């Protein structure tokens with residue numbers, strides 16, 4: 001059976017709690033307020049916005065000592081042709097030392113800030129364009145849709161459009177699709193391209209095309225992976241796993257049970273050839289098509305993950321096909337564990 005109310009309860013159990021959500025919002029709000037009011041940075045900071053699975057509503061509850069993550073993108077007007085990625089990032093060290101002394105560390109492409117209730121990631125970016133195109137892009141990045149403090153599931157009317165306010169549609173692709181930001185890579189010492197706004201937009205659109213089920217299916221698959229982590233490779237996880245899920249899921253999803261079985265079956269058939277080749281697929285990033293989201297995933301890890309999905313899919317199919325509530329819920333619980341409730 002589909003057991004829609006049981007899936008609803010399961011999803012309530014695996015979302016970040018209200019306390020964690022408030023902690024995410026508070027940490028991000030305080031960081032962005034401090035940046036906005038910091039005088040030595042006012043001439044270079046164009047705007048800031050939220051990226052991360054919490055912003056996209058694809059994150060699961062942290063367990064144990066783990067805390068929610070906020071990924072903050074700082075959009076600057078620095079000239080990436082004349083300033084090194086290291087110097088661009090170094091411009092932000094007095095801010096961190098003033099407000100988060102002893103709690104921040106330099107990472108490859110970002111700064112990490114560790115508080116007791118939240119982890120913050122500060123990504124410095126620059127706009128490669130110039131002139132009128134740069135001004136149009138900056139007006140996009142200063143809009144309400146980019147500055148929003150809300151997660152994706154909290155505002156279904158959100159669109160990537162400078163006219164949106166909390167029905168407009170996404171702006172035309174010609175205005176943003178070929179306009180990634182650049183971001184430092186200190187380990188490579190070069191500016192790379194990144195397009196978080198395109199990823200967020202794609203996620204929101206896919207969730208609409210799937211009747212709100214996409215982000216919940218991402219959460220469910222992440223929970224399944226966590227509950228079966230000793231039987232699975234460590235990778236894929238996080239965003240590459242989300243991306244695989246969004247690739248496998250068809251538009252038009254009508255229920256969690258149906259969508260799970262469909263995306264697992266499609267995953268298994270679509271990648272059967274590459275699995276038998278003992279290879280891994282290329283999947284282009286939304287926004288930067290030249291980038292392989294699976295670049296760091298090994299073929300061995302992909303093939304192990306694929307076998308994990310094949311095993312899970314047999315259970316999921318029998319769970320969906322079962323005509324008895326208790327048997328169906330027991331099969332679903334074999335996938336997801338005790339957070340999936342038995343029907344009363």
Ligand SMILES: Nc1ncnc2c1ncn2[C@H]1CC[C@@H](COP(=O)(O)OP(=O)(O)OP(=O)(O)O)O1
Nearest residue numbers: 051052053059069071238239240285292293294
């Ligand atoms: N392989 C990849 N390809 C393209 N973009 C990527 C990427 N990995 C990350 N990004 C982009 C997407 C947003 C940004 C931060 O990604 P996090 O590593 O924080 O992954 P998040 O989705 O937040 O999952 P979490 O593990 O945190 O639950 O970098």
Ligand SMILES: [Mg+2]
Nearest residue numbers: 052053069071
């Ligand atoms: Mg994250």
Ligand SMILES: [Mg+2]
Nearest residue numbers: 247248249250
């Ligand atoms: Mg698809």
